[PDB]
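Give me structure tokens for this 137-residue protein.
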Amino acid sequence: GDEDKEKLKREAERALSEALSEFEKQGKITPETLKRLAEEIAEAALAQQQGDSERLEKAARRFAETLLRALKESGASAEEIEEAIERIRKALSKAPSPQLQKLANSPQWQTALQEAIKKARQEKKEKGSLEHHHHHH
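Here you go.
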């Protein structure tokens, strides 16, 4: 049992790459993590053409939960989290795919994002998030 979801994954990995472009430029985030976040968008955008509302909520929540770790790992605060998710909203709304444009406009996806901004606002500030080793591998 398999499906050609790779077509949406290759379109979505660019959405995060352009949205979080400044976070990667700053060394807050990695291109592997930007792809890992967009792999959940691929499922959510394919679900929009299938009309599967339950997928939109679950995939958007899983994406927004993962994204919060990738940002907080860099020492991000609620102000950086709430700017970061907003960039995916533009990148999806401006996307090359009509499935990704429908995803940016989807209430089931957009509601799951609010839970991630309010989660980061409940914590407000980082614990410290500094590193003392090269980690070259």
